[PDB]
């Protein structure tokens, strides 16, 4: 099995190498996609917050108005 091992190790040598090259390809797309999905969710998270804050800012100045009057009649 001298030709059998000299030949088979060339098939296994390429097999392990084949996937090596294939791995980098499969992994490289799995990073490009992740960046894309970072930038997408960075945008959404910023939106959800931005919206929710202005909801709150307003809720703020309505209770801030009522604590202006609520305490003054509460005084006497």
């Amino acid at each position: 099995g001298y030709e059998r091992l000299k030949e088979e190790l060339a098939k296994a040598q390429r097999e392990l190498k084949l996937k090596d090259e294939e791995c980098e390809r499969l992994s490289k797309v799995r990073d490009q996609l992740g960046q894309e999905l970072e930038e997408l969710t960075a945008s959404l998270f910023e939106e959800a917050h931005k919206m929710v804050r202005e909801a709150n800012i307003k809720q703020a100045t309505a209770e801030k108005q009522l604590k202006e009057a609520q305490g003054k009649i509460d005084v006497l």
Binding site: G34, A42, F45
Partner: protein, 175 residues
Amino acid sequence: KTYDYLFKLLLIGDSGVGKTCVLFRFSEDAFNSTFISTIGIDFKIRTIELDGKRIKLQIWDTAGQERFRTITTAYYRGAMGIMLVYDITNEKSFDNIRNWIRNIEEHASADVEKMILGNKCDVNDKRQVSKERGEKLALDYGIKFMETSAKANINVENAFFTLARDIKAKMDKKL
């Protein structure tokens, strides 16, 4: 125009530990509202200046749920600096810090900058983790350590600026 850099950061750790306040204090929010509880992700931006340049920090805060397993890897894999965060009020949090260090080593990149953040240092009377013992963990793993308080507002801004300096100094090395 400006900024003139973008560091992507990640906060990771046990729940209860106050990862999320630690953020909310750095990003300077006036409010409490977050999606960490319910979703398990939240996110915040802050640009700072370091030796004159603008540096945009994108900070992800991850809470492990298996629900979004894939997405949160994407954050690990793409993260430039990650903060490991325990509660000094709680041991297992501290014990797990090793466990996370796994993930970071296993899910994240080979040169990532790393920082152990001992949180709630403010409440000493409920202290279970000695600082001394805190530093030793860090030194063992050759990583920076820092005790913090999201609530007393202790070392949070410094923790970040320190990690941001560490990221930049590394990148400026590849001129």
